[PDB]
Design a binder for this molecule. Structure first.
Ligand SMILES: Cc1cc2nc3c(=O)[nH]c(=O)nc-3n(C[C@H](O)[C@H](O)[C@H](O)COP(=O)(O)OP(=O)(O)OC[C@H]3O[C@@H](n4cnc5c(N)ncnc54)[C@H](O)[C@@H]3O)c2cc1C
Ligand SMILES: Cc1cc2nc3c(=O)[nH]c(=O)nc-3n(C[C@H](O)[C@H](O)[C@H](O)COP(=O)(O)OP(=O)(O)OC[C@H]3O[C@@H](n4cnc5c(N)ncnc54)[C@H](O)[C@@H]3O)c2cc1C
Lengths: 495, 105, 491, 105
């Protein structure tokens, strides 16, 4: 008959990324028979990778590493003043770096196949595709299909880089997916977009010494506190990066082919019809990502999505409309598209289903950090979001600048690092927003996100003793509010 | 010369192509430092013992073999006696290596 | 008002200066008396106190000098053509540090002028009720009066009381501005001052040795203390335990020279001698509360420690004589503390505020080769105060992503939290050993002021990829006994 | 060259023995970068004006003097002619300096 007389697996996970792998290891922790299906369809230029998902292969890991490469460039300079006989300028080798990064990714691709073998989880490098109730069709690289069945199924396909849909892009343009393993030094680069992906990349490329440009449609970091967003943009421009606002490419043409080659980019203003063209060695598109929820047949099984975004609507328990088909990660509708989230969601969904746990995943006040030349960490509401939700008259914003002690001997960048908190007057001056721009922003923001899960208030904050001498201690003594209007710009080394 | 097996098919088939001959397997990874350091030696070691059968397995180019065998670290060396797993150790300890091809010739 | 000022502060350090600026924020007439009596070798410095001149600032900077050494090595693996091994110049570094200190000294003199708070580089010293005797460097005395008085003299390095020390031995007070590269160095002590200094000296390439009486970092979680020692040992720093020097002999004078130490086993009688270029004593500090006449005014202290007993409002027995900072008795001797205490004591006295300073769960960080941050109770202190059966310790190792490409030090960075079973697994202790330990510990101290619990912690989403996120998923307890030693690159 | 002042007496009183011949006071610090940057220009500019007597006041050595003149940052220049502050600016701006000297001769 139709339905399978029995189920091959208690559960099948479609997608071997951050969420799917954490969920597989968890379910299998309680014995259950599980199988993960992971296949990475190539990018237009043929680039592909191993197991582990977006963040491990073409996301967090490679990006933070390259960020560290740029930070080390700054460290090489900063050392001379602390008495280290460094050359004035040191050269950087693109290939050496890419190889080192690919070597770490490679070790992780491997670490994950082992962990799956460890928990006795069936890993299959095939493309999963629903065909009917409790039935799926896997297709390996060679083309050998096979159907499976499982009591339950978990969608965790994540997303992929989105293209412009203009002439010349899919052929001469690279996405973040290609950058992290590019066979040659990029050279003159034009970054298209203003997402954190765009600025983080534009940022470290400039850090290792490349001529980087960024073409922005409208704003910067759409969805983040704008006051902070611009402090970041301002900093990048201050540190070399060139910006082109209110513009968008309409066509790309190859001048010469090469490793790298040379390209011409024609672009048109956002409103006016003014058009300009520039010449670049490499053009990257960081204009957004798209859920892999279409070409995998959900209709044959019933799961309903959002006909326009591709996002999957689920219950706070991650379940979709069909009682045996759950979903997590980026593809989710109105959630948090971050690795730790997908992972928290995955580990919990498995405990409810097989451990008895009844704990739900909290999507409230999740902290985040953007790794731009000057790191930015945040948690909670932004300023603009605070006034809107609580009324301008109950929102007190406490801020201050700060100068990392480590930057005084190299004597650089004073009054750049900025800190601020949004407080709700009508709620015991509860801290509803946390923002920091500076060194190790993430290390700083983590503990404060926990404080926020404990409903931290201004009084409690003021009562905490800072650690000296450390950047983070600035948050323990903020006394100047934006409302009062007092100056927060500090004096330089000479007074 | 060591055979760079490209399939679990050419693996279990090769294990046979060796009569009473001992099958020494090198589980390697291009991304692993000590793994590449001991590689040249495995190659010059493969010769000194043209009586033993030297097999190489890059855990990625054919992860389906290393998968079975239960490899966890690189480098890993496993010894076979006509299909049955006799010897096996980890690390780029070359002395230990040769001293195993001896003991279990 | 038959009173010159409304308040006089004796000591221009962390506490005194923060208190002066605060009081003066409400108009009050204030005057700060700051004088830095020289060290045995004549060394001295400007305004700002211990931390600014011979403490936190210079020490963290030199720590950064060593960190940059490690960074120079680490850049190569990331693709930077750094020359082979780079040399480091002692003098270049000292000059840069002194330049920044000189700058802070000036910011403090200017800051004080601004708030209209009289500054006098004079050694104050009580003579009677509401009266004090200041003595400038030249010798010109002068008496003053104020409605109230604040003691904030802090401490100074303590000596061994043995033959040859005060003449051939330097304290932290001299190190930070030493005119020449130290060379072969023997650090005496095991306080955080001792290990932090031993640590960065080794970091810039010097042969460092540390002679320990008994244990390391007494007063800190010992499990952590030893993880630190073990690390230093693995990174050069040679140790010598169970010993204490009995006399120092100069093999020669120099810039530097050649000295010779004589130490005797603490537990036995065996004695040994070594040769060093420089010998530093980091064996403790002593309150400057004796040679300043408190009897003539009445304030009572502790005849043996020198500490000053005060009310939770900082007031001593005499209603007009307050006190803050290190000298205080059984409190926490850290700059931020002294400063929080100072800013508050001024608000109660002149602002109407009734807020007291919290000495509970103050966070701290020791800047050793591998930083260590802590907040709350230690493990040993937790079992004692709550009973071993209600103390669950969750821990884990972690490998900073930044260290994987340089491929170094795996399973060194360690994190742990102490939980009170009987109180909803309240987090009563926080410990982290690794990069940026302080930046990591700060926010968690605030969480602790909000009574953080395991459930709440587990409910928080970590930031990836960042070290601190390790604390958001600790699942292995010491009790269970499971392995936490993770894996290396090749697996 | 330039008369290095180290007293309030060598100042408040010597600002007389000069007469009217303009006297530019240089408030500097051994620890301020730009303070040094302009030092040579100030000393080699002293050799370029006889009708002008140059003075250099170190803010730390003469704390009494710097705070008695209301000094905020370095480098800070102040001009006098018979004990009258007829000029005063901050920063290591060399042009503004020689300019302020040539316009208050
Ligand atoms: C450049 C960049 C930088 C980022 N930086 C950060 C950061 O610093 N911090 C952070 O928290 N997040 C970051 N992110 C986001 C983070 O990587 C994602 O939120 C996370 O990877 C999502 O996990 P997931 O399990 O939902 O999906 P993914 O990790 O995307 O995994 C899905 C996997 O399934 C595969 N797959 C797709 N369709 C199928 C199919 N039909 N059959 C089988 N397999 C399929 C995919 O190819 C992929 O391997 C970054 C993303 C990018 C692109
Ligand atoms: C090597 C070292 C490293 C340290 N590192 C750190 C660190 O990283 N973080 C941290 O939080 N703390 C650190 N500390 C401790 C910190 O410096 C002290 O906690 C802080 O300075 C105490 O402040 P205070 O105001 O009580 O006194 P102090 O800062 O010691 O100031 C007292 C001032 O009064 C002067 N004085 C003394 N007697 C008289 C008198 N009779 N008349 C007039 N003036 C007098 C002193 O000379 C001094 O200028 C360190 C200390 C040392 C020695």
């Amino acid at each position: 008959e139709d339905l399978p007389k029995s189920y091959d697996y208690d559960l099948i996970i479609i997608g071997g990324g951050s969420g799917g792998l954490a969920a597989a290891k968890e379910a299998a922790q309680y014995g259950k028979k599980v199988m993960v299906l992971d296949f990475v369809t190539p990018t237009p230029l043929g680039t592909r990778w191993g197991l582990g998902g977006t963040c491990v292969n073409v996301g967090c890991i490679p990006k933070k590493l390259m960020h560290q490469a740029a930070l080390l460039g700054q460290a090489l300079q900063d050392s001379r003043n602390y008495g280290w006989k460094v050359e004035e300028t040191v050269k950087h080798d693109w290939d050496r770096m890419i190889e080192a990064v690919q070597n770490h990714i490679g070790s992780l691709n491997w670490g994950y196949r082992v962990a799956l073998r460890e928990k006795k989880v069936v890993y299959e490098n095939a493309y999963g595709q629903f065909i009917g109730p409790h039935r799926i069709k896997a297709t390996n690289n060679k083309g050998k299909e096979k159907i499976y069945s499982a009591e339950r199924f978990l969608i965790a396909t994540g997303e992929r880089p989105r293209y412009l849909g203009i002439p010349g892009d899919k052929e001469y343009c690279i996405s973040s997916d290609d950058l992290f393993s590019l066979p040659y030094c990029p050279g003159k680069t034009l970054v298209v977009g203003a997402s954190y992906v765009a600025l983080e990349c534009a940022g470290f490329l400039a850090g290792i010494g490349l001529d980087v440009t960024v073409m922005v449609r409208s704003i910067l970091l759409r969805g983040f506190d704008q006051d902070m967003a611009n402090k970041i943009g301002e900093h990048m421009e201050e540190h070399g990066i060139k910006f082109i606002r209110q513009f968008v490419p309409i066509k790309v043409e190859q001048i010469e082919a090469g490793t790298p080659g040379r390209l011409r980019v024609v672009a048109q203003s956002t409103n006016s019809e003014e058009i300009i063209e520039g010449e670049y060695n490499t053009v990257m598109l960081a204009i957004g990502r798209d859920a892999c929820t279409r070409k995998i047949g959900l209709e044959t099984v019933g799961v309903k999505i959002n006909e326009k975004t591709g996002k999957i609507p689920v219950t706070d328990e991650e379940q979709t409309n069909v009682p045996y088909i759950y979903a997590i990660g980026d593809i989710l509708e109105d959630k948090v598209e971050l690795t730790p989230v997908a992972i928290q969601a995955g580990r919990l969904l498995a405990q409810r289903l097989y451990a008895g746990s009844t704990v739900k995943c909290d999507y409230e006040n999740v902290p985040t950090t953007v790794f731009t030349p000057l790191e930015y960490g945040a948690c909670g509401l932004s300023e603009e979001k605070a006034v809107e939700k609580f009324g301008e008259e109950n929102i007190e914003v406490y801020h201050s600048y700060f100068w990392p002690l480590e930057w005084t001997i190299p004597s650089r960048d004073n009054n750049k690092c900025y800190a601020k908190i949004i407080c709700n007057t009508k709620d015991n001056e509860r801290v509803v927003g946390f923002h920091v721009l500076g060194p190790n922003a993430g290390e700083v923001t983590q503990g404060f996100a926990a404080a926020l899960k404990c409903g931290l208030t201004k009084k409690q904050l003021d009562s905490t003793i800072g650690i000296h001498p450390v950047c983070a201690e600035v948050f323990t003594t903020l006394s100047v509010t934006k409302r009062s209007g007092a100056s927060i710009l500090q004096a330089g080394s000479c007074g | 010369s060591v055979k760079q097996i490209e399939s679990k098919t050419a693996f279990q088939e090769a294990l046979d192509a060796a009569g009473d001959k001992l099958v020494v397997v090198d589980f390697s990874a291009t991304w692993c430092g000590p793994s590449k350091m001991i590689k040249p030696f495995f190659h010059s070691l493969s010769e000194k013992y043209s009586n033993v059968i030297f097999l190489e397995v890059d855990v990625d180019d054919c992860q389906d073999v290393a998968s079975e065998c239960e490899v966890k670290s690189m480098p890993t060396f496993q010894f076979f006696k006509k299909g049955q797993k006799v010897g096996e150790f980890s690390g780029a300890n070359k002395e230990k290596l040769e001293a195993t091809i001896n003991e279990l010739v």
